[PDB]
Design an enzyme around this catalytic site. Structure first.
Site, PDB file in Angstrom:
ATOM      1  N   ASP A  96      23.043  73.238  52.849  1.00  0.00           N
ATOM      2  CA  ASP A  96      22.426  74.510  52.521  1.00  0.00           C
ATOM      3  C   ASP A  96      23.365  75.606  52.978  1.00  0.00           C
ATOM      4  OD1 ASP A  96      20.246  73.124  51.639  1.00  0.00           O
ATOM      5  OD2 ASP A  96      18.877  73.803  53.217  1.00  0.00           O
ATOM      6  N   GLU A 181      11.927  67.891  48.122  1.00  0.00           N
ATOM      7  CA  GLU A 181      11.760  66.455  48.082  1.00  0.00           C
ATOM      8  C   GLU A 181      10.359  66.073  48.597  1.00  0.00           C
ATOM      9  OE1 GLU A 181      15.309  66.345  50.510  1.00  0.00           O
ATOM     10  OE2 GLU A 181      16.513  66.603  48.651  1.00  0.00           O
ATOM     11  N   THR A 337      18.520  60.054  44.090  1.00  0.00           N
ATOM     12  CA  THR A 337      19.792  60.539  44.614  1.00  0.00           C
ATOM     13  C   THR A 337      20.635  59.351  45.050  1.00  0.00           C
ATOM     14  OG1 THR A 337      20.758  62.184  46.106  1.00  0.00           O
ATOM     15  CG2 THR A 337      18.784  61.053  46.885  1.00  0.00           C
ATOM     16  N   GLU A 375      20.641  62.092  40.987  1.00  0.00           N
ATOM     17  CA  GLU A 375      21.656  63.000  41.478  1.00  0.00           C
ATOM     18  C   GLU A 375      22.678  62.266  42.356  1.00  0.00           C
ATOM     19  OE1 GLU A 375      18.340  66.590  41.797  1.00  0.00           O
ATOM     20  OE2 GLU A 375      19.259  65.836  43.675  1.00  0.00           O
ATOM     21  N   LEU A 378      26.038  63.544  47.985  1.00  0.00           N
ATOM     22  CA  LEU A 378      27.050  64.321  48.674  1.00  0.00           C
ATOM     23  C   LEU A 378      28.104  64.820  47.700  1.00  0.00           C
ATOM     24  CD1 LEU A 378      27.458  62.087  51.838  1.00  0.00           C
ATOM     25  CD2 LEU A 378      26.265  64.347  51.640  1.00  0.00           C
TER      26      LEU A 378
END
Ligand code: EPG
Length: 486
Positions: A96, A181, A337, A375, A378
């Site tokens: 973030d 999430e 992910t 997704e 990292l």
């Protein structure tokens, strides 16, 4: 005819595509970046639609100005759009970059009622998201959290109707917890957790305590309390009696608690998705949730970090197929992910198995008849990462004459930046998009959506949990893609 092999590629926009001030002020830069994505054949973009930006003034004081400007720019680029209903803070989770809290007037409620926040066993309040315990509590100037979420989505639909009708907005991802999430905030990286700690159970808010008491009493155990043999955030499983091999997670009491904790997450998703489905009824969109990829401790019996995140996943208990079964009546998608990760890339001490976790989640979704997207976890720019994503996107490789047996419905790349779209990084990314598209050009008509039907009949938690057992082996995945980048 390899057309049925095509997998859409979306790119996440920067976290502050819209500024922290709810202004669209980086449009020219974004337009230039979008040209590079279009040159690469990208299908669309994904963006956070931040609650704290739009409903920041006060209740129902929605300010859609900046987002409408953004969406017009994306439409004028010929790109599709995945909109995340971002009911969470930006700041405090990995990667973030930018700081955007939930609305201040919501947080003000927390001064007299601090139990609106997920709370840990130390009493620490996490201010990033509202506990699922207040989903149906009318604490926010007369509205419950679920009402707030539904009203936000309604306003979004009304304001964004032209982009829906034009086929620009094609996906609505409903944020269901921290970082969007569907999880508890069990690994707070800026307040006392460091990877690969087991994390903690974040169920100590008074609303969740009262719910547990009621659940325990209903089965004749009013005296049961949350487990106290669980250690702390940065422990490993063998440091604790709960999570160690042959530990108390296996006991009657342990099982009941873990079921309660994980079931509440499932119920939270179901009730919010029901509202979302009512909002978007009849629009040609799909609704999605995001499941976090808790790959650390997957190799040990307790799956400790999954358990504390709220995913009750064990060797003999499929804690993702239950979630998938809950999604079925909504015709909701799973967005997962870790699509880029290999097990060999992880540290030994993390006891980490992202490949196997990805295989499990994808297989669970497919067994429940869902669309499954993914997704990368990292930032990665290298061919190996792209080839790992390609393997996961078409686990059985290319079918030469029709659709393959399984495939991702889409992949979303985290995330657009200037670094992505220059030099070698850009060359690698473009080739990746070609391979995802089975070496075909971009197809603006691919994967058409029907008008969204109403969710089917509500099913009980007991019905959902029939999916947990027996645990089934995953579908077979190739070790390597048959269509690598080169
Ligand atoms: C938790 O795969 C991780 C994604 O979370 C990050 O990106 C999201 C999408 O932009 C955003 O909503 C979230 O706040 C951020 O941490």
């Amino acid at each position: 005819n390899v057309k049925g092999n095509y997998v859409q590629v979306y790119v996440m926009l920067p976290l502050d595509a819209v500024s922290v001030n709810n202004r669209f002020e980086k449009g020219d830069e974004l337009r230039a970046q979008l040209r590079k994505l279009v040159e690469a054949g990208v299908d669309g973009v994904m963006v956070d639609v931040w609650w704290g930006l739009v409903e920041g003034k006060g209740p129902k004081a929605y300010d859609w100005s900046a987002y409408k400007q953004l969406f017009e720019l994306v439409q004028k680029a010929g790109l599709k759009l995945q909109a995340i209903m971002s009911f969470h803070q930006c700041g405090g989770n990995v990667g973030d970059a930018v700081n955007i809290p939930i609305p201040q007037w919501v947080r003000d409620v927390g001064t007299r009622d601090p139990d609106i926040f997920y709370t840990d066993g130390h009493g620490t309040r996490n201010i990033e998201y509202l506990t699922l315990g207040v989903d149906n509590q009318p604490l926010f100037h007369g509205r419950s959290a679920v009402q707030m979420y539904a009203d936000y989505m309604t306003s979004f639909r009304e304001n964004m109707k032209e982009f829906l009708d034009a086929g620009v907005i094609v996906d609505i991802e409903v944020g269901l917890g921290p970082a969007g999430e569907m999880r508890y905030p069990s690994y707070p990286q800026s307040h006392g957790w460091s990877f690969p700690g087991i994390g903690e159970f974040i169920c100590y808010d008074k609303y969740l305590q009262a719910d547990f008491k009621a659940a325990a009493a209903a089965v004749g155990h009013p005296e049961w309390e949350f487990p106290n043999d669980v250690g702390q955030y940065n422990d490993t499983p063998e440091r604790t009696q709960f999570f160690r091999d042959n530990g108390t997670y296996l006991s009657e009491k342990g099982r009941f608690f873990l079921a309660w904790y994980s079931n509440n997450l499932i119920k939270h998703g179901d009730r919010i998705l029901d509202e979302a489905n009512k909002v978007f009824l009849g629009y040609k969109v799909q609704l999605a949730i995001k499941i976090s990829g808790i790959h650390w401790w997957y190799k040990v019996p307790s799956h400790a970090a999954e358990l504390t995140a709220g995913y009750y996943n064990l060797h003999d208990r499929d804690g993702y197929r239950t979630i998938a079964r809950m999604l079925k009546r909504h015709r909701a998608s799973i967005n997962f992910t870790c699509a880029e990760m290999r097990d060999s890339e992880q540290s030994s001490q993390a006891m980490s198995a992202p490949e196997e976790l990805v295989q499990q989640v994808l297989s669970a979704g497919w067994r429940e008849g869902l669309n499954v997207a993914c997704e990368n976890a990292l930032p990665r720019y290298d061919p190996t990462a792209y080839n790992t994503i390609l393997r996961n996107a078409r686990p059985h490789g290319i079918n030469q004459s029709g659709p393959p047996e399984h495939k991702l419905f889409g992949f979303t790349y985290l995330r657009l930046s200037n670094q992505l779209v220059e030099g070698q990084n850009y060359a690698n990314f473009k080739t990746f998009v070609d391979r995802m598209h089975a070496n075909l050009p971009r197809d603006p008509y691919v994967d058409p959506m029907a008008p969204l039907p109403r969710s089917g009949p509500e099913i009980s938690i007991e019905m959902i949990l029939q999916a947990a057992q027996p645990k089934l082996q995953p579908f077979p995945f190739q070790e390597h893609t048959d269509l690598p980048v080169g």
